[PDB]
Amino acid sequence: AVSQRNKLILWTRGGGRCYLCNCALLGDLISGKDKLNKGYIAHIVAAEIDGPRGDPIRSPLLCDDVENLILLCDAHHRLIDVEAVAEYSEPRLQQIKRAHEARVEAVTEITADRGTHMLFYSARIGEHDCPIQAQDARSAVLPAYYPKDRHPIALDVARSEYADNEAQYWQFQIENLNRQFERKVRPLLADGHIDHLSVFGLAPQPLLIHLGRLLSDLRKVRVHQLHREPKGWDWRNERPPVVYKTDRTGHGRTIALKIGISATIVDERITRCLGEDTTIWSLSAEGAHNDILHSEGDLQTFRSTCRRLFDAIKAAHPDATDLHIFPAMPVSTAIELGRIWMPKADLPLHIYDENRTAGGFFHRHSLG
Amino acid sequence: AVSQRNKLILWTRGGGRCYLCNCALLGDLISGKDKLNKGYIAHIVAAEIDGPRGDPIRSPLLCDDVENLILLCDAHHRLIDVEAVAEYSEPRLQQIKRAHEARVEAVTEITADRGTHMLFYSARIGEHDCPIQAQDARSAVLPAYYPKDRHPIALDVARSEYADNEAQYWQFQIENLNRQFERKVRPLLADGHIDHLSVFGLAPQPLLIHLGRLLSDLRKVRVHQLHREPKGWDWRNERPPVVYKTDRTGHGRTIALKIGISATIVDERITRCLGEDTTIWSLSAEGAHNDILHSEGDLQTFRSTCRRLFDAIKAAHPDATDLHIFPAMPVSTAIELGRIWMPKADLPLHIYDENRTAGGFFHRHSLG
Ligand SMILES: [Mg+2]
Ligand SMILES: [Mg+2]
Ligand SMILES: [Zn+2]
Ligand SMILES: [Zn+2]
């Protein structure tokens, strides 16, 4: 008889399907319908010397050799053993066997990769009080991804002797994010060992938008959000979906977009900063607060909503100079704004940041 | 211990692959490398009451139940039993089991006659930032087809020191598309090595139409579209069908057709570069935007609409020598335009391209 191990090997290699018609044999095996041929195993060289394609030497030599076995439903076992023996010689059955098993392996191999690389963008990476820590990141990617390497790729929000309201800070942080990406990320992407990137960013919104721009050409990226109670970076999905809705005020030719997702922004702060002659488009979340981005669906609906608004804005204003962005966005949406921006389909973006020391909005960074 | 029959069932349903990374386990099973966990079987609810997700009632109830078993390599068995027990809850592991076994069955169902060759037309084929990659293509042909060869056939939008706004560039790309097609595709067709062809094109629309013309006589072709959110080349089916509208303006001697599916094209832009003595036919999609081609039905309905429009244009202008095409089309529709054009009955096509930064439409290619 055929060993249980050879049965397992052949059924795995054969995908549990008839090698001539591909029909599914597992359900019948479980049902015990394999009374004529246990396990639906067919011998190419018959185990019996007097059988179809039998041989006095090779029949006993091959009766428990998996390289001599195929799976057949009862009908097609009868076809190669009784009705059409001459049609199905050892080489022809052997070639159907290789081809069936090669095909099965190739299709079960095709699937998205689960392994991911963590990318951190934050101040104080590697220090005791860093708000993104490797053990919290490695847990947060499960179970949708698993860490392919234990250690994150570290992009530093580098320590600086300039404050958020001095231009000096923004030039230093932008060029330093640029050097950093071009130094530790690009060579690993070029090299091809990274197939999925899990992103954990905590930085001023203009820098997070630039990070998103740097990630825009990548195919496998999952952005994470810092959640607030309990603190952590794992996606949750426990609340009703965030409701976003778009609007506009004014009719000047300076096009602005305020994005009030974690907070509200009144139109005054934009007109006080831009001209009085403005059009202020709006992307708002109902109940805007800094813990509003709860679930990945919330992030996807932001991406698609923001995409629709970007199209609508350029369609409504075919005389484009730029678009002036005024954000109050969770870190995950700020990265995704930069990631979905299309360098030559969208308007160029001028990103404003609230000077929290004294005074309102100031232009700190641009895309395009 | 787990029965030999349940081991066979699980190994067949699982395709002999780790349910967390999809790596192949049979070779290691045959080699006796399954020293820590025999057969690479992991219990979701542990067989041991004291184990991960163990239970005094359900552990013995399920220790020989195939619905509680998965296949795992040693590293991911340790991931769900030691490192990340809480993250990998029974419901989350059950999802993975159901998804893994559903995919394995659906892909092994694809019969041997459904094999396909991937054909790429794009810049930067084989580089990390190419927007068409072998792994996304081979996933995209499933479950309708399976890749007959692991490697795509690469037609390059070849690098040159020419710019798209000078004629030499277009002449260069056309001879290179012709040469590569004649040597990498055609010689394999005659014998039957290449039969069904799955096509992934990302190129300037006039070159994509030419690609379609090169495919025009082929009987087995499936064109793919590059989608956004999520990125990928797999056909989707989540939206209402695209709505197409055919219309016409003017009564002039020179016949034009604008095809605004991913964007709108106003009549000016046709009027001169061509003149005022024009008839401007139109084939537009309601809500034209760059991700509008969602489903394979949307592409088929484009084919039939464009076919009907071509006939109507020929009937309406029996003294017309040719037709001036002004496209703003998804990549898949552009290929299919070239593929359905009939030299026998249709007007010759002069294809125009939007000159970036200079501005305006310029004649870059012709068919017939
Ligand atoms: Mg037999
Ligand atoms: Mg276990
Ligand atoms: Zn059969
Ligand atoms: Zn694994």
Nearest CA among A178, A44, A143, A236 for reference residue B97: A143
DSSP for B60-125, please give it: HHHTT-GGGEEE--HHHHHIIIII-TTTS-HHHHHHHHHHHHHHHHHHHTS-GGGEEEEEEEESST
B83 within domain boundaries = yes
Quick check: B338 and B216 in contact, CB under 8 A? yes
* Rounded Cα–Cα distance for residues B138 and B149 (Å): 9
- Which residue in chain A is spatially nearest to B150 when comparing CA positions? A106
DSSP for B18-76, please give it: -TTT--B-HHHHHTT---SSGGGEEESS-SSTTSTT--TTHHHHHTT-GGGEEE--HHH
* Rounded Cα–Cα distance for residues B153 and B120 (Å): 6
Instruction: Answer yes or no: do A125 and A231 share one domain.
Output: yes
Domain edge (last residue) among A109, A143, A174: A109
**Angle at which helices B331-340 and B296-316 cross, to 10°:** 50
Nearest CA among B351, B318, B37, B42 for reference residue B207: B351
Q: B81 a known binding residue?
A: yes
Instruction: Answer yes or no: do A104 and A222 share one domain.
Output: no
Cβ within 8 Å of A, B 231-290: 231, 264, 289-290
Q: What SS3 state is found at A22? A: coil
Which method was used?
A: X-ray
Resolution of the solved structure (Å): 2.4
Quick check: A338 and A367 in contact, CB under 8 A? yes
A69-71/A41-43 β-pairing: antiparallel
Instruction: Answer yes or no: do A145 and A101 share one domain.
Output: no
B235 within domain boundaries = no
* Rounded Cα–Cα distance for residues B140 and B146 (Å): 9
> In this complex, do B87 and A143 lie within 8 Å of one another by their Cβ atoms?
yes
Residue in B8, B108, B150 nearest the CB of A8: B8
Q: What SS3 state is found at A282? A: strand
Q: Which residues, 6+ apart, have CB-to-CB distance to B166 below 8 Å?
A: none
For residue B268, give its domain range. 244-367
Instruction: Answer yes or no: do A199 and A336 share one domain.
Output: yes
Instruction: Answer yes or no: do A94 and A127 share one domain.
Output: no
- A43 DSSP β-pair partners: A69
A83-121 exposure pattern, b = at least 16 Cβ within 10 A, e = fewer: eeeeebeeeebeebbeebbebbbbbbbbbeebbbbbbbb
Q: What SS3 state is found at A278? A: strand
Residue in B87, B111, B150 nearest the CB of A22: B111
B238 within domain boundaries = no
DSSP A38: G
- Could you tell me how far CA A179 lies from the centroid of its own chain? 25
Instruction: Answer yes or no: do B124 and B220 share one domain.
Output: yes
Instruction: Answer yes or no: do B248 and B362 share one domain.
Output: yes
* Rounded Cα–Cα distance for residues A90 and A69 (Å): 11
Neighbours of B167 (CB within 10 A): 11
Handedness of CA A70, A74, A75, A77 (dihedral sign): positive
DSSP B291: T
- Side-chain-side CA neighbours of B44 within 13 Å: the count stands at 23
Domain edge (last residue) among A74, A109, A144: A109
Quick check: A34 and A112 in contact, CB under 8 A? no
Q: What is the CATH number of the domain that holds B334?
A: 3.40.50
Nearest-5° Cα angle at B178, B321 to B169: 75
| First-residue to last-residue Cα distance in chain A | 72
* Rounded Cα–Cα distance for residues A54 and A51 (Å): 5
Give the pair of three-digit tokens for residue B277. Answer: 């003595």
Among B69, B108, B129, the strongest candidate for a mutation testing the A interface, having the largest count of A CBs within 10 A, is B108
Instruction: Answer yes or no: do A102 and A233 share one domain.
Output: no
CA of A72 to the centre of ligand 3 (A): 5
Instruction: Answer yes or no: do A133 and A57 share one domain.
Output: no
Residue written as tokens 């029974």? B90
Neighbours of A160 (CB within 10 A): 14
- Which residue in chain A is spatially nearest to B357 when comparing CA positions? A344
Domain edge (last residue) among A109, A133, A157: A109
Backbone angles phi, psi at A205, to 5 degrees: -55, -40
Number of domains in chain A: 2
Instruction: Answer yes or no: do B147 and B68 share one domain.
Output: no
Q: What SS3 state is found at B151? A: coil
Instruction: Answer yes or no: do B220 and B314 share one domain.
Output: no
Amino acid found at A239: R
Nearest CA among B243, B213, B238, B220 for reference residue B228: B238
Amino acid found at B198: S
B237 within domain boundaries = no
User: Which ligand ends up closest to the CA of A59?
Assistant: 1
- B153 DSSP β-pair partners: B119
| Cβ-Cβ contacts under 8 Å, A344 against chain B | 356
Give the pair of three-digit tokens for residue B109. Answer: 């169902």
CA of B14 to the centre of ligand 2 (A): 17
Instruction: Answer yes or no: do A151 and A9 share one domain.
Output: no
Q: A63 a known binding residue?
A: no
Quick check: A352 and A361 in contact, CB under 8 A? yes
- Side-chain-side CA neighbours of A322 within 13 Å: the count stands at 12
